Every structure is written in C-alpha cells, then in structure tokens.
Design a binder for this molecule. Structure first.
Ligand SMILES: *[C@@H]1O[C@H](CO)[C@@H](O[C@@H]2O[C@H](CO)[C@@H](O)[C@H](O)[C@H]2NC(C)=O)[C@H](O)[C@H]1NC(C)=O
Ligand SMILES: *[C@@H]1O[C@H](CO)[C@@H](O[C@@H]2O[C@H](CO)[C@@H](O)[C@H](O)[C@H]2NC(C)=O)[C@H](O)[C@H]1NC(C)=O
Ligand SMILES: *[C@@H]1O[C@H](CO)[C@@H](O[C@@H]2O[C@H](CO)[C@@H](O)[C@H](O)[C@H]2NC(C)=O)[C@H](O)[C@H]1NC(C)=O
Ligand SMILES: *[C@@H]1O[C@H](CO)[C@@H](O[C@@H]2O[C@H](CO)[C@@H](O)[C@H](O)[C@H]2NC(C)=O)[C@H](O)[C@H]1NC(C)=O
Ligand SMILES: *[C@@H]1O[C@H](CO)[C@@H](O[C@@H]2O[C@H](CO)[C@@H](O)[C@H](O)[C@H]2NC(C)=O)[C@H](O)[C@H]1NC(C)=O
Ligand SMILES: *[C@@H]1O[C@H](CO)[C@@H](O[C@@H]2O[C@H](CO)[C@@H](O)[C@H](O)[C@H]2NC(C)=O)[C@H](O)[C@H]1NC(C)=O
Ligand SMILES: *[C@@H]1O[C@H](CO)[C@@H](O[C@@H]2O[C@H](CO)[C@@H](O)[C@H](O)[C@H]2NC(C)=O)[C@H](O)[C@H]1NC(C)=O
Ligand SMILES: *[C@@H]1O[C@H](CO)[C@@H](O)[C@H](O)[C@H]1NC(C)=O
Lengths: 86, 419, 99, 50, 49
C-alpha cells in the first residue's frame, strides 16, 4: 500500500521487515495502482462486477485458473427511445 | 376564503455529507519511531493495536458501503437522447458536459471547485505512520451514476424506479406531476411557456447563487476540516514529554542507564497509547454520525428523485414536483423543484347549496361568490365554473347544514330535451 | 451555560404555529397563509381520510362536543399521574448523576 | 466521552421531533401510526422543559 | 363484511426530548485546584484540555 514498487525489496538475504517470503517481481505481473503495487495478478482489459475490492476502481477475481485484476463495471448500457409524441 | 390566482416554480438546494476519509495508522512507527530497540518493549503490552487496526478497517469498509448505498440505485446506465428538446425546458446546466475531460455538469464543476518547496502536511503526517486510503469509487464513476439517474428521470419519469423504464413526453409527465398535487392538467397545458421560463430562470438563479456565495457548502467543508485537525493534533502529541526527561527516545537511550530509561520509555509509551485510543474513539463516534447522514441521503434519493413525495417539507419548501441529484466532494446535492401559490384573492364561501329542498355539495372543489353570483372552483387555483348537477352531489335537505345558502343548480338535460 | 432561546420565545413560536394552523389550515406551511373557516377545513380533513364531506356537516355539533371532551380528559391525565413526563426527567437525572 | 454519546442520542430524538412537527402539524399525514393511533386528522404542539 | 356506523374523536399525547444541559469544565481547577506547582507540572502533559 502506497508504494511506488520501484523501491520494492529486491532482497539479498535480509533487507525487508516481512518475514522473508519474497514474491518474484519481474515475472509475476507487477502492476501499479493508485492504492499501491499489486504482485501476482494479471491486469485485463475486460470489465466485470466487483468481486474483491482493491481500490480506486480496481477489483480482483479468480477466473480463467488464475487471479486477475480489472476495472469494475457500473452496469449494462441502456438507452430510452425518447420522443415527444410517443 | 382566499384562493390563489397564480403560481411560482421554485428551485432550492440541499447538501448532505455521505462519506468520510479512510485513515490507517502504523502503531509501532507512531510510538517507537525508527529505534529498533524501543519496539521490543512494546511487545510487553498485549494485543493493544490489533483492536485499533480492526476498528479502523471497519470504518473504512463502512465508508464505501455508505457511498454504494447512496449512489448505486440504478440497474442500468441510462443515456439521454442526442436531441435535447424537452418541450421548452433547458436542462443544460445539470446534464454532463462532453467538451471537458471530466464529463461533469456546469454545477458539479463549481461544487468541486468550491470545496477544498517545504515539506507538505500530508508528507509530514505520512512520515509518522498515518496514511490515507483511496475510496473504492472514483469521482468519474459517481458522476456516471448521477448522469444515469438524471437521464432516467428525464426520459421515463418515475417508471424506471419501479421496473421497466417507459418513455413519456416531458410535458405529459409534468402534467401528471401537476395532477399529483391537486391541480388539473389544463392549468399546465395552457401555461407551458410561462412554466418553462420560470424553471429556466430559477435554474439560472441557482447558477448565480452558488457561483457568488462562498459559504454555502460549509456542511461538506466541516467534514474535511474535522479530519485534518484530528490528524494534526495527533502529530503534536509526539512533542510532549509526559513527565519524562525528553520526548526523544534516542537521546534517552544514549544518555543514561536502563534502570531509569525503563521508566522514561514506559511513561512515553503510555502517553502515546492513550492518545491513539482517544483518536480511535472520536473516529468511531464521527463515523456513526456520518452513517446516519448517509442513511438520510439514501432515503431522500429513493423518495424525492425516484418518485413524487407527499410528505411535507421532505423534498423542499412548497408542493414537491421533482428533484435532481448532483455529486459533490464527500456528499450529494439535491435540487428540489416545487410549486408555490401566489396572488390570492378574497371570496365569500358556503358549505352547501339549497335547491328544490335539497342540499348540494361540491364533488371536488369549493363554492365561491364574486359578490353577486356563485361558482365552484378547484381549491389550489381560481377557475370559476357554473354550478351544475355534474360537479355536485345531493345529501339530505337544507334543515341540517349550518350556513347553507339559496341558489340555482343548472340541469344540462332540460335544454337538450326541450330542443 | 444558559440556552440561547428563553422559554417565552419558545412559547411565542408555539403560539404562532397554533394560530397559523387554526386560521389557515395547512396552507401556511407551503407558502402564503390563506384563511378558511374551521368547519370547512375540518371537512377537507375528513375528505383526506376517505369520508365524504356531508358526514361532517350533518354531525358538526356532536363532533365538536366530542373534541371538547377529549381535550378535558387530557388535562386529567396531567393532573392525576406523575409518570407521564418521565423522559425529560430522565435526561435531567442523567446529567445530574454524571456531574 | 459519555457526554458525546448522550448528545448523539439527543440529536436523533430532536431530528425525529422536527420531522413530526413538519409532517403532523404543518400537514395531514397518511403514514400509519406516525401521528397517533387511528386515522390522523390534526396535531397541536406545546412546549415543555427541554 | 363489517362496516362501521359511528365514530369517535380521539386525542392522544406524545412527549419528545429536544435539548440537553450545556456544561463547561475548568481543567486546572478540577485537577490541581489552588496549587501552582501542580499547574506547572500539568502544563507539560500536552493539549488534553
Ligand atoms: C416532436 O419531436 C420531433 C423529433 O425530435 C421534433 O422535431 C425536432 O424539432 C426541433 C425544433 O427546433 C429541431 O431542432 C429538431 O431537429 C427536430 N428533430 C429532428 C429529428 O429533426 C418536434 O419539434 C417535436 N414537436 C414539437 C412540437 O416540438
Ligand atoms: C402570473 O405571474 C407571471 C409572472 O410570474 C405573470 O407573467 C408576467 O406578465 C407580465 C404582464 O403584465 C409581463 O410583463 C411579465 O414579463 C410576465 N412575467 C413572465 C416571467 O413571463 C402573469 O401575468 C401572472 N398571471 C396573472 C393572471 O396575474
Ligand atoms: C439553455 O441554457 C444555456 C446556458 O444558459 C443557453 O446558452 C446561452 O445562450 C445565450 C444566447 O445564445 C448565450 O448568450 C450564452 O452565452 C449561452 N450560455 C452558455 C453557458 O452557453 C441556451 O441558449 C439555453 N437554451 C438552449 C435551447 O440551449
Ligand atoms: C381580504 O380581506 C381582509 C379583511 O379586510 C384583508 O385584510 C385587511 O388588509 C388591510 C390591508 O390593506 C389591513 O389594513 C386590515 O387590517 C386587514 N384586515 C384584517 C381584519 O386584518 C385582506 O387584505 C384581503 N385580501 C385581499 C387579497 O384582498
Ligand atoms: C361576478 O360574476 C358575474 C358573472 O360573470 C358578473 O356578471 C357579468 O358582468 C358582465 C360585465 O358587465 C356582464 O357582461 C355579464 O352579462 C354579467 N353576467 C350575467 C350573468 O349577468 C359580475 O360582473 C361579476 N362581478 C360582480 C361584482 O358581480
Ligand atoms: C331560502 O329559501 C327558503 C324557501 O325557498 C326560505 O325559507 C323561508 O323562510 C321564510 C322566513 O321569512 C319563511 O316565512 C318561509 O316559510 C320559508 N319557506 C318555506 C318553504 O318554508 C329561506 O329563508 C331562504 N334562505 C334565506 C337565507 O333567505
Ligand atoms: C354515535 O355516538 C354518539 C356518542 O359517541 C351518540 O351520541 C349520543 O347520543 C345519546 C342518545 O341520543 C345521548 O344521550 C348522548 O349524550 C350522545 N353523546 C354525545 C357525546 O353527545 C350518537 O347517538 C351515536 N350515533 C348513533 C347513530 O347512534
Ligand atoms: C512510480 O514509479 C514510476 C516508475 O519509476 C514513476 O514513473 C512514477 O512517477 C512513480 N510514482 C507514481 C505515483 O506512479
């Protein structure tokens, strides 16, 4: 949360407070959101209803099977055939 | 009796806060700072800050719930027709503007503008373990929801709030709403231009009033202010000694022996923990207040925007006609359109009419006299008519009603039969 | 600290509300106050609940009598019982206990 | 803290009182059991200590 | 079906609290009273008041 993740711990033997469960950065779909940096989720261009809220309009889900991140959809488009004699 | 002879279309505003700022606290960094040896003593106090994290997470989830329950009341995203003719009503001041990149209305932009190299305050607070979490819904999404609600209420009336959206011309919808407050349809159909002009002028006056005055949104601004101050105080509490020799623990540790350093660090830790607990309690109380306000806003969205309300003074001052929503930073603004009587006149009135030994009462209106002659009119608008058997009903004789008067009730059948 | 509004001002506000509702019905709550005879507005209110107007006009005196009696009974409920105003007393007692 | 909680409760009660003043005194209400038991006709306000 | 043939006019009462007592507290008078050195020591405790 709130990390540019260009400063994410590359790590050698011990330079991170988390108890040394380093997750691979380059090869595990690092993504940058306004809520921070997400590791282990693939960003897709589709849009579904929110499943797990990440933040700033970004949600995550388990689909395909892997974890994906996307922008939530507010609903299905609809247009009313307005006229002034109908 | 006094009967109005004219009317006015009024537009008023109501501002309601919806959501609060979501904050997060790093307990170890706030209390012991960067010194890795102070944190060892913190473990001897139990699970003191897991409760803090739990409460703050609950508040953060509740804020998103508030926003969702206020603004996400539409199943589909309705789109306004490309042609913006609605019988003379303009609506251009509340519809989204496509030229601007924000896709916001001329009034939403003003609202967002109104509500608000040395280290910034945000960075200074962040360097001590206090952070702000972004909301789930962005401003663009809330603007989209508001636009969908506006398009639905302009194209379908109140039908889209109870099922499938059914199209209806705007003049006919306004006639329905006039019928809803006890005024006949021909009153609107014979004054369409005047009513449209009055509505447009009122919308322009809302424009000018919101643009000129700068203290109208103090309800929302307070919500912002009460947050910032609450954080600032916390930071200031880091500069108090709480009875110790100094407020810097590195100096204490590099200065003297553990036997007294224990007491110094203990009193510092107790003071910091007390400050954090007080902050959390105040946050919980303020969250309850915000939740009540958001519930009221959701009820008003359901009952004033998605329908026509008969409750007095719930959706403005006067007889409610309709309502339009707009989004504002951390809140919502309702524009209420209401009907106000004007230009009343004096008349003499009677409760019943005596004719042929029978008492007649008006079916819908009231009996009035201009000085020599008697008519029957609707209650909210002066429109005299000849008293016939088609707008009256008979009950009993004239010996029971107090105040009955003598007049003639015209039978439409006799002239047609004799001709 | 003393409240901003005194009891006389609140009594004035209540008297204004009562006078408006007695002389004008519900019109003063939505715009200009329009006068109407009290019997006619009572007939309007009877129409509001689904009863025809004549039912009032043919039973006026009796209805009035009933109303009067009811008001009198209310007074007895405030001159025989000592637990009707318990909520305000509870507020006062809670403040005093905290202090 | 206790004073703040009590103030919140009092504010809720005052909001209800304002709504009842608006809807039962300034108009005729169709809501069931909001302005008494039975079919509401009218309402009259009186002031009391607090 | 059952249909009424008469009616009754009923008057009932409802009591609602509106306001609360407004109180103010003097810190140093409650905590320290008339002792100056207690006030000097309390001036170091922050901005609780
Ligand atoms: C009924 O609807 C039609 C269809 O929109 C209206 O025709 C429009 O009239 C305006 C008048 O300035 C034109 O600018 C539009 O270009 C017309 N529409 C199209 C598709 O060309 C018609 O005016 C409406 N009826 C009334 C009485 O206004
Ligand atoms: C009802 O009020 C409207 C104004 O709200 C009156 O319309 C005005 O009429 C005068 C004519 O003397 C014009 O000079 C004004 O420009 C009109 N105003 C607007 C806004 O159009 C209307 O005449 C009134 N009706 C009655 C019966 O008195
Ligand atoms: C609807 O309202 C807009 C805005 O008030 C009107 O646009 C104005 O039109 C006049 C005359 O052409 C111009 O002098 C103003 O500069 C315009 N203002 C803006 C903000 O564009 C518009 O004429 C009104 N009517 C319609 C049919 O759109
Ligand atoms: C209806 O009649 C009443 C009664 O005359 C009018 O009220 C009077 O208004 C004048 C102002 O010109 C006052 O000087 C009188 O004192 C009022 N009388 C009372 C008894 O208060 C009222 O103005 C009339 N309304 C209209 C629209 O003509
Ligand atoms: C009250 O209404 C009556 C009915 O309209 C008015 O009487 C009419 O007055 C005009 C004006 O000269 C005459 O042309 C009509 O022939 C009259 N009608 C009838 C049926 O005779 C009356 O003027 C109005 N005003 C008063 C004070 O009575
Ligand atoms: C309305 O008309 C009736 C009769 O059409 C009037 O009743 C008459 O009142 C006079 C009083 O001077 C009696 O002498 C008559 O015997 C009554 N008529 C009948 C048929 O009994 C009544 O007075 C009229 N109302 C008003 C206000 O003048
Ligand atoms: C409806 O009820 C009222 C009372 O609630 C009845 O009025 C009473 O009638 C008797 C006999 O005439 C009198 O002794 C009482 O004094 C009346 N009561 C009041 C308060 O005036 C009325 O008669 C009933 N209606 C019917 C049709 O029986
Ligand atoms: C995050 O890192 C990228 C890449 O170095 C940089 O361009 C960007 O300015 C940083 N900050 C944000 C908020 O994206």
């Amino acid at each position: 949360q709130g990390v540019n993740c260009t400063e994410v711990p590359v790590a050698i033997h011990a330079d991170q407070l988390t108890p040394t469960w380093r997750v691979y950065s380059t090869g595990s779909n690092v993504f940058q959101t306004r809520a921070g940096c997400l590791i282990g989720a693939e960003y897709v261009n589709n849009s579904y209803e929110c499943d797990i809220p990440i933040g700033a309009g970004i949600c995550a889900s388990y689909q395909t099977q892997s974890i994906i991140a996307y922008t939530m959809s507010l609903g299905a488009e609809n247009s009313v055939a307005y006229s002034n004699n109908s | 009796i006094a009967i109005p002879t004219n009317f006015t279309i009024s537009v008023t505003t109501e501002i309601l806060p919806v959501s609060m700022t979501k904050t997060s606290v790093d307990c170890t960094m706030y209390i012991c700072g960067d010194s890795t040896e102070c944190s060892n003593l913190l473990l001897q106090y139990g699970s003191f800050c897991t409760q803090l994290k739990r409460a703050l997470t609950g508040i953060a989830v509740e804020q998103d719930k508030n926003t969702q329950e206020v603004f996400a009341q539409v199943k589909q995203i309705y789109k306004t027709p490309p042609i913006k003719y609605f019988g003379g009503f303009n609506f251009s001041q509340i519809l989204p503007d496509p030229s601007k990149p924000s896709k916001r209305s001329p009034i939403e932009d003003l609202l967002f503008n109104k509500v608000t190299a040395a280290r910034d305050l945000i960075c200074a607070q962040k360097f001590k373990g206090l952070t702000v979490l972004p909301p789930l819904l962005t401003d663009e999404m809330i603007a989209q929801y508001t636009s969908a609600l506006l398009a639905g209420t302009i194209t379908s009336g109140w039908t889209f709030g109870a099922g499938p959206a059914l199209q209806i011309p705007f003049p006919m919808q306004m006639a329905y709403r006039f019928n809803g407050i006890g005024v006949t349809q021909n009153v609107l159909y014979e004054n369409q231009k005047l009513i449209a002009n009055q509505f447009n002028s009122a919308i322009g006056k809302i424009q000018d009033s919101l643009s000129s005055t700068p203290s109208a949104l103090g309800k929302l601004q307070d919500v912002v202010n009460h947050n910032a101050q609450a954080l600032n105080t916390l930071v200031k509490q880091l500069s108090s000694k709480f009875g110790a020799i100094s407020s810097v623990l590195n100096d204490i540790f590099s200065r003297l022996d553990p036997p007294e350093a224990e007491v110094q660090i203990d009193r510092l830790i107790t003071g910091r923990l007390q400050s954090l607990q007080t902050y959390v309690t105040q946050q919980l109380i303020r969250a309850a207040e915000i939740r009540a306000s958001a519930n009221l806003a959701a009820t008003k969205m359901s009952e004033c925007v998605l329908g026509q309300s008969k409750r007095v003074d719930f959706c403005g001052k006067g007889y409610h006609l309709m309502s339009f929503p707009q989004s504002a930073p951390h809140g919502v603004v309702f524009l209420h359109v209401t009907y106000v009587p004007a230009q009343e006149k004096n008349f003499t009135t009677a409760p019943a009419i005596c004719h042929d030994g029978k008492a007649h009462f008006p079916r819908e209106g009231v009996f009035v006299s201009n000085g020599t002659h008697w008519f029957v009119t609707q209650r909210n608008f002066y429109e005299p008519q000849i008293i016939t058997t088609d707008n009256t009903f008979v009950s009993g004789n004239c010996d029971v009603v107090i105040g009955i008067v003598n007049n003639t009730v015209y039978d439409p059948l006799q002239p047609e039969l004799d001709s």
